[PDB]
Amino acid sequence: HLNFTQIKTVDELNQALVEAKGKPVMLDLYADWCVACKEFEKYTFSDPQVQKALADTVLLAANVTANDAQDVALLKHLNVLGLPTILFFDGQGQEHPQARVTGFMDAETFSAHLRDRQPGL
């Protein structure tokens, strides 16, 4: 398993971004009712080469299972329309929307995505 730091709100994300100055960041958004999110955890975040590739990346995640007010505010703020979504931030805490992942990617596909599109590295 990869070690994700849980964030709940917009400003916990922002703070995490500020604290991560100089490092690449990755924000995974999941929910318990999300089938493809679990696929990601089981078949992709579990890959030995995927994990190596994220070794130096700050790992954040938001559990939006409850779809409460803070969850919805976070999703809006990030313009996230469905799950799974993964967002990527460079070393200045800026997002690179062109690196978003918005469906399941298998290990080989996600490796290639990180190699070809991951920011801040």
- Number of helical H runs and strand E runs in the chain: 5, 4
DSSP 3-state percent helix, strand, coil across the chain (nearest 5): 40, 15, 40
Q: Which of 49, 26, 7, 50 has the alpha carbon at shortest distance from 121?
A: 26
Question: Which structural domains are found in the chain, ordered by start?
Answer: 1-121 (3.40.30.10)
CA distance 98 to 44: 20
The method of structure determination was X-ray
Q: What is the resolution of this structure in A?
A: 2.2
H-helix segments, the chain: 10-19, 35-39, 48-53, 69-78, 107-117
CA distance 87 to 118: 10
DSSP state of 104: -
Beta bridge partners of 64: none
